[PDB]
Symmetry: C3
Subunit: 462 residues, 3 copies
């Protein structure tokens, strides 16, 4: 039996942001979302999130996530950010007076923390019958972390915060993860004895360690060797570092499953994205949101896709696209913009300098050059000429061949197998197999240039 | 006298690919190509490649490479992938029964291995009269490598594979490169004594080390300090790591020879690419295949060129281009697509949102905006107006000035010094110094807006 | 009282460049500019730059910088590059014979050196009454640096250059920064005793250390723990390394002040660039020159801006732009090119495949697709149709709606609230609230396709 509390009520001042800290994102989820996902998977009996000043703007998001994960998640309010020890006091208040399970505590700013790490913590805590078990790790750069103080016998004595530590204690590289398990009665007892006489004038959860040690209670540290899993984020430098570590891991998972990723460092892949076997992803690419790529695709370089579905054997090269689907074998890019509601059929082509918005494009249809397609439905095996505009519904049939520089003034229907001539402005329906035209005939004005541009390079050349 | 065997007949299952492992690429060559290049340079008397199941799809590539490098390269077949010791047995069978030279063995998945490392190995082997000499290195992360076992006296005892090693042996950081020299008679003798009773149930080449030691034969390890040269690739994570290490080295070679590379980490340069002095390469750039850049060019950011020749003092900025030539002083980009067969003369310009395919563009000619040029030949000092389409042969002369929004309906010829008006559809030849036109005259419809868009922001503004 | 000499007269041969070494750039300033900025801030009584062969091409730049920093900076000439000891002799000659202040020496190729490091040096020098104080640091890779030689008692004995050091001395990791303070009389004395009998046959400033030690003078090393501040650049590999270190620092400063930078490694930010709170910068972005970004902007991915001003709450996505302004709330990109003199009003939009040059675009005006706008002034709340060309002054009023595929043949004026039809060539003024047109009427040719493309997929479909 376990209750997990998530401390998410600090001001977040070191982020320097008007967006609450725990709402900042990496890999397509907010830090609080990452932490709640890992905990839902652990499936404890209770899950409490302590919220503070910005609670109006965070609580609804927590309720959406409770729905999403199919479990209830309570919110305890912490009126003023008096310290992590005080946040835990506020959290405990959402539990019955007589609750008797373990209490696990973690921060909203430790977003790589995973279900396994949490499980192992609870198992260690129970195995050594500890009044408190604290996760620790060891870091080349421990700046900002509580330092682990040990006796000569390697027994944990205390946690000292970066603001309170001596120059000498600051060299300690073993750090507090800020992830704990507690005996409830011992935790309640230690919290009632915290005082705020320290360099931040705050009630430190970390003092509970020396307090329980005081009482001769069992204090156990558990060393997490993979430091990333328990790394924290207090500012945007640390946010981008952990986002980059998490992104290397996501990419590695894909590479081990069969995806070529030419340059992991410049390939950003959100956590829910799936990618098929033998796809090759070229440098400078972001795959975001619920993007799904099939097998044997080529993607990038310099492509950004957010919520885009791509079939098998497609090419999507230098493409900026969102909320769109791209069929098997289709070719998109280079220099192609897909706006929401774009559906391109199998073996379709959208070429260079083409933008599509809210349009359906049938199997085998090509829009290869300098064209805008908006609010239109186009059939199968059609060909849209270069430098054209769908001026915006318009329906174009199958096996149509439209000429370069055609404007389609919505709404108009072009029948199956119809053609338009180059330079046509289409303002009315075109029957199946008809040719629509409107450009006037060419006229040559002889020797114009000698007359109107006399002594010019063009005049001398003629 | 030396025979080199290349073991390339394993299944490659950890790549998770339908393309044989040794055919995966980095820096524009397959791993097997890299390994055969380094060995051809060493120029041994014999060169044998052991191939397995996918031999149908690899052997032809080996024959093309034998042709390319001007030497014969035999292929020995290994029916079933029974282990590296068994692959070497299959390899030896392509040698005469009575062969008496040294036998060098290396893997197809060690692609940074170079001629010098191989030479030094053979020199060390001969100098210490070893029955076997094995290349080793030392690594922070030795996962997956055979560990070097040494006695108290630093004498090499054995090689233990990652699957077979104790937790304690796994901490050993000195690893087997999988590159060896052998006395032939000792190698034949040791191979006939391998058994497959180990964690992979395979015949391990690595066991030969403890077997020859058994017989009191001389076993010598040679430490390669530059670990990269002997790094292996068993999966796509390791492939991208070694591709990135190799790319840093290629870029560094260019920087030391006089190329500014603003961001090595995001500049990918294939091994055959040459680049002239005082060129500056901006971030996000890939130079691929047989690309050649002259001196004092500016290239990037975000440019990909495959098989592109660029003269001296050209600019090629945000350009995606292949199999094309760009003359001295020419300017291309930003946002420019070159398809195969593009030839742009000296001081030519191809601007933003211009795509060219299979066209010749003469000295000093500019195509600056939103235009497609396909299957066309254009002369010197001409100017193609914005938003135009070559609708596809068409020949345009020198000193021509064509107006914006001209469609050139192939095939048509435009004489030297000719003009077209804006909005012209050109369907017939235009004489030298003539002006071709087809747009109708402008008509203004007064107060249309008050009538047809009454109470609109446009109506109120008028 | 202090004189600072900057040695900038070496040939720079290891750069392999026709641009003098000290003129190569990182983060938008030349190395010599970086070094002179840091020294001006220290504000010593005298500032002397020693220049050599390329002095004609460097001295004017030094005079511009003296003006910029509001102080005089003398130039001493060093006829032939006889060595750093000889450069300092040439430098001293720009001082009075009887000068009595401290002499600080530094290189033009140490460009992260900052005012604080210099101040601390002078303070240490004066505090220990040293005849010479040398800055040192310690490096994993000390290749190319003079090695610090110490006695058993940790007293500094000598500096040995990489070319002159034994294999064993080469393992020394503590290096000479090439930054010194001197007693003037001791420096003059030691310089007159240098000889050039060493591996480079040069007069080494570094020998002065062992010479003053010889005379029983006080020699003090001061260890700089942040090695970057004193790192040198002798070749383009080292230039890009230090440019990348400096760029991480600039980005970090922005992240700590409130800027989200998703990928520091692929975000390049020049030193004078300012960026507002809660802006998000996406990967592959360069912000160059005097670029200024306001708050809550979104910038990138793949955007390059040089000297661009962007208001608050704007979006500038996949944009290549220079010397332009973008108003509050405006939207630019993806795939947008801004050339110098572009001014886009608040809430304006420049869309995909749009290039603007030397044009003013008023509040709320949209140019969303495939258009070139050159040398034009456009009013407020207007809408420019897709695939249009300003053929280049032209003035367009407010609340205008122009139709797709309009060519505006400069110079023309379009009144407030005017419209043009799709496919119009505008060659004369259009009154306020008028509609201008020129395209001919559509004609459908029935069954053309069965007649002219018989048995085609289009013919069968009809
Ligand atoms: C005193 C303390 O605990 N310090 C720990 C805290 O430092 P650190 O300084 O990171 O602690 P923070 O200021 O980030 O606050 C901890 C978390 O608890 C929440 N919160 C904070 C204050 C408050 O009054 N109410 C509240 O709910 C915040 O949402 C925050 O996410 O985590 C580090 C690891 O990341 C540990 O090494 C430190 O030992
Ligand atoms: C038992 C053995 O040798 N292990 C070595 C092998 O491990 P490793 O596990 O990498 O060996 P692999 O499975 O990659 O096979 C070695 C190479 O030989 C070829 N091959 C393999 C099996 C086979 O039955 N037939 C065949 O021809 C494959 O093409 C492969 O490229 O290389 C490592 C370095 O990269 C060394 O540290 C290991 O000591
Ligand atoms: C002999 C000497 O001093 N070596 C130092 C020099 O090596 P390093 O080999 O880098 O010295 P350089 O060749 O770069 O020359 C030093 C600087 O002085 C100027 N210059 C050089 C030669 C000359 O004849 N005239 C002249 O004015 C150059 O502009 C150059 O920027 O800096 C290193 C750190 O960067 C130190 O570790 C070395 O101890
Ligand atoms: C071809 C065309 O007329 N496109 C229009 C059209 O673009 P959308 O792609 O629907 O957002 O509506 C816009 C007004 O929202 C206007 O700015 C633009 O000119
Ligand atoms: C200006 C023009 O008509 N371009 C054509 C033309 O492009 P290419 O660039 O030749 O591949 O042929 C294509 C059919 O292969 C067609 O899809 C496209 O519309
Ligand atoms: C729409 C138009 O006619 N643009 C012209 C025009 O471009 P600028 O953007 O002004 O540089 O002048 C150029 C001659 O300098 C010519 O190459 C091009 O065709
Ligand atoms: Co924190
Ligand atoms: Co291997
Ligand atoms: Co130097
Ligand atoms: Co037109
Ligand atoms: Mg704080
Ligand atoms: Mg295996
Ligand atoms: Mg030198």
């Amino acid at each position: 039996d376990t209750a997990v509390l998530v401390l998410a009520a600090g001001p977040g001042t070191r982020m320097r942001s008007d967006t609450p800290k725990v709402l900042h994102t990496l890999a397509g989820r907010s830090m609080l979302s990452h932490v709640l996902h890992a905990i839902a998977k652990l499936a404890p009996q209770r899950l409490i999130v302590v919220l503070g000043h910005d609670h109006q703007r965070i609580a609804p998001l927590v309720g959406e996530l409770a729905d999403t994960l199919g479990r209830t998640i309570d919110v305890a309010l912490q009126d003023r950010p008096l310290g992590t020890g005080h946040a835990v006091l506020c959290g405990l208040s959402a539990l019955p007076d007589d609750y008797a399970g373990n209490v696990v505590v973690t921060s909203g700013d430790t977003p790589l923390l995973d279900a396994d790490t949490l499980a192992d913590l609870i198992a260690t805590h129970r195995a050594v019958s500890a009044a408190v078990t604290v996760l620790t790790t060891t870091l080349d750069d421990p700046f900002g972390y509580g330092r682990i103080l040990r006796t000569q016998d390697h027994e944990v004595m205390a946690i000292v915060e970066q603001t309170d530590a001596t120059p000498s204690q600051r060299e300690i590289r073993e750090v507090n993860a800020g992830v704990y398990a507690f005996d409830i009665a011992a935790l309640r007892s230690a919290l009632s004895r915290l005082s705020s006489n320290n360099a931040q004038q705050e009630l430190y959860l970390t003092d509970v360690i020396a307090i329980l040690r005081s009482d001769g209670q069992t204090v156990h540290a558990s060393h997490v060797d993979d430091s990333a899993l328990v790394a924290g984020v207090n500012n945007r430098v640390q946010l981008a570092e952990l986002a980059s570590e998490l992104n290397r891991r996501v990419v590695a998972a894909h590479q081990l499953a069969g995806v070529t990723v030419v340059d992991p460092a410049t390939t950003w892949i959100d956590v829910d994205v799936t990618i098929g076997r033998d796809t090759v992803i070229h440098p400078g690419t972001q795959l975001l949101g619920r993007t799904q790529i099939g097998g044997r695709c080529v993607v990038g370089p310099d492509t950004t896709l957010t919520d885009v579905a791509v079939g098998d054997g497609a090419s999507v090269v230098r493409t900026h696209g969102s909320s769109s689907s791209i069929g098997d074998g289709a070719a998109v890019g280079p220099f192609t913009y897909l706006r929401p509601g774009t559906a391109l059929g199998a073996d379709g082509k959208l070429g260079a300098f083409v933008e599509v918005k809210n349009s359906t494009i049938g199997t085998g249809t090509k829009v290869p050059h300098l064209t805008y397609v908006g609010d239109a439905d186009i059939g199968e095996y059609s060909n849209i000429g270069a430098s054209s505009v769908f001026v915006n519904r318009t329906t174009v049939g199958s096996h149509v061949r439209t000429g370069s520089d055609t404007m389609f003034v919505a709404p108009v229907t072009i029948g199956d197998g119809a053609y338009t001539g180059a330079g046509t402005v289409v303002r009315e329906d075109v029957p199946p197999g008809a040719l629509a035209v409107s450009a006037g005939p060419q006229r040559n004005i002889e020797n114009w240039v000698q007359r109107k541009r006399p002594g010019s390079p063009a005049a001398q050349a003629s």
